[PDB]
Design an enzyme around this catalytic site. Structure first.
Site, mmCIF file in Angstrom:
data_model
loop_
_atom_site.group_PDB
_atom_site.id
_atom_site.type_symbol
_atom_site.label_atom_id
_atom_site.label_comp_id
_atom_site.label_asym_id
_atom_site.label_seq_id
_atom_site.Cartn_x
_atom_site.Cartn_y
_atom_site.Cartn_z
ATOM 1 N N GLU A 196 0.780 -1.121 -0.112
ATOM 2 C CA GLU A 196 -0.159 0.145 -0.170
ATOM 3 C C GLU A 196 0.893 1.572 -0.006
ATOM 4 O O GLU A 196 1.355 1.891 0.833
ATOM 5 C CB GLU A 196 -0.754 0.127 1.110
ATOM 6 C CG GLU A 196 -1.823 1.279 1.451
ATOM 7 C CD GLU A 196 -2.545 1.516 2.767
ATOM 8 O OE1 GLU A 196 -2.493 0.480 3.355
ATOM 9 O OE2 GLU A 196 -2.958 2.587 3.147
ATOM 10 N N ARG B 258 0.904 10.218 0.589
ATOM 11 C CA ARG B 258 1.364 11.193 1.405
ATOM 12 C C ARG B 258 2.465 11.936 1.065
ATOM 13 O O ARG B 258 3.207 12.879 1.966
ATOM 14 C CB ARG B 258 1.351 10.550 2.581
ATOM 15 C CG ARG B 258 0.283 9.882 3.240
ATOM 16 C CD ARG B 258 0.472 9.203 4.538
ATOM 17 N NE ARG B 258 -0.745 8.368 5.086
ATOM 18 C CZ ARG B 258 -0.750 7.557 6.103
ATOM 19 N NH1 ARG B 258 0.629 7.518 6.836
ATOM 20 N NH2 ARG B 258 -1.730 6.657 6.514
ATOM 21 N N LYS C 226 -11.444 -1.518 6.191
ATOM 22 C CA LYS C 226 -10.361 -1.063 6.977
ATOM 23 C C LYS C 226 -10.632 -0.601 8.296
ATOM 24 O O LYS C 226 -11.922 -0.089 8.180
ATOM 25 C CB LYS C 226 -9.407 0.092 6.453
ATOM 26 C CG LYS C 226 -8.238 0.661 6.963
ATOM 27 C CD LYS C 226 -7.610 1.744 6.133
ATOM 28 C CE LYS C 226 -6.429 2.657 6.744
ATOM 29 N NZ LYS C 226 -5.962 3.455 5.665
#
EC number: 4.1.3.42
Lengths: 213, 213, 213
Positions: free
Chosen positions: C45, C49, C133
């Site tokens: 993943e 960011r 999640k």
């Protein structure tokens, strides 16, 4: 936000502590405000949890121009319009909804809505907001929660409220993502009743001074 | 609500405890319901967590007129329609969504949806609801969370559920914002398996009496 | 989900651990991916960011085809489309919004969105999702909070993330509702900068070994 002359950011950066006010009797509005300002606290959140709420905002606005007076507990587009008309410089809500976000962005004063989860934070961001209330702080997971949120959302800034006191407000203020905190300890209920504005000024003064780290 | 014959408030104020039922064998539905009513508990929430859940609601609706039977774990309009057709008097959901809120509002029976945050509460309020389920109570932060989440919303009433036991339900019932609590200890699986209905009636009686004062 | 060639479930059942990657320097992307794969971990993943996040996904997709590379911190339709175009095989978001969900369901790759409350879970389920999640896991109340939230929903599975470590990941993996967990300890920032890929492969192998239940 395109239509906000006074940014949400400026409201939250004015001071380290924003008093969450609940004025039961109108008469106590101005003396309380002046009492707070005298202690170094200028941003006042007048919560719409009383009949004289809207009148206490107007009163504080006319008689205490230095105070940055706003409304708290704004839940819908009509209460937002009502406080905006009454001279509120900003609006704070415990949570957010789309109708509220919409009316806000279309309005003229800044709205700093509360969120508890990142899904709620994302809804707010979809409307372009960058400043939020983190309520109720403790229940949401406190400091640790905010530290986790800073990972995917490093640019977002908060004003945690709910369970914050001189015993812990410093733990929150230390976070980069935290601009200020909300608290109701600055104005003890008994204080207004007894007309102990002297005490209110000392609490405010102690709040700010203790906020220096 | 305009379209609801039975108010959500009437459901929550009928008694201090609403049993959150999980019945796997349809043959146990009716006697279990009568046992409950015999113990003074007449608002029964049959959760849509088993194959016979809906058939169970229909049986109780037809055979136990001294009880107000409703559905639990209603997750969407499809299930709401099913339980309504089955004879459910009310619907309870673990949380809420706009499609569910809309279908319930236009529907004929009251929906008492669960919430964890003030934004979820506010969305529910945007649809006209004033009574909510606080789930999962303990995970949401318990009594303190509810005391904070209910603070800015004086007129809202809750039915806390999740982690509620005889050891702590009095702590919730003692809250001004709480009308009743939801508990799953009144109908233990083991007791339901051995057809121990006398034990179920007692649990109901103790729940009712243990909630007094 | 009709439009997803690869199911959300397959992504999460690939391995017990999904590294939440923050890569600042593009050149480190490929060797990092190869190191994790060599450690037995291949669902990567790449969080949105950092500036090179998208190029990192593209490079990994190109130079390390044996890995199942995807994106994290996907906040809206635009980013979802951007990572999909760049070669992401799946998308992960901290939370969910209706626009993100609608766009994901119309799209070609699986979205595994984060939720914190049952209402958010229900919204995701309205769009047909079954895998989510749970973020921020620890701050949300950890294992206990997840067990309560999962109680009334027996068909949904999770990927807890946020404060998960070798010390507690087994506590989550032991749950029937948990398929895998997300963690950032497999790729420490200092290891990346120092190009210490042997260390990354070791952490990965240890992560996999310690997860056997």
């Amino acid at each position: 936000m395109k239509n906000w002359k006074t940014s949400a950011e400026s409201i939250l950066t004015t001071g380290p502590v924003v008093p969450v006010i609940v004025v039961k009797k109108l008469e106590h509005a101005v003396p309380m405000a002046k009492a707070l300002v005298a202690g170094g606290v200028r941003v006042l959140e007048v919560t719409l949890r009383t009949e004289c709420a809207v009148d206490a905002i107007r009163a504080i606005a006319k008689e205490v121009p230095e105070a940055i007076v706003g409304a708290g507990t704004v839940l819908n587009p009509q209460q937002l319009a009502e406080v905006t008309e009454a001279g509120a410089q900003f609006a704070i809500s415990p949570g957010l909804t789309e109708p509220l976000l919409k009316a806000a962005t279309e309005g003229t004063i800044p709205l700093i809505p509360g969120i508890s989860t990142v899904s709620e934070l994302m809804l707010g961001m979809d409307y372009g907001l960058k400043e939020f209330k983190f309520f109720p702080a403790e229940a949401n997971g406190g400091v640790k929660a905010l530290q986790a949120i800073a990972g995917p959302f490093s640019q977002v800034r908060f004003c945690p409220t709910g369970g914050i006191s001189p015993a812990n407000y410093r733990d929150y203020l230390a976070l980069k993502s935290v601009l200020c905190i909300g608290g109701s300890w600055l104005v003890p209920a008994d204080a207004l009743e007894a007309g102990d504005y002297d005490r209110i000024t000392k609490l405010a003064r102690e709040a700010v001074e203790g906020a220096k780290l």
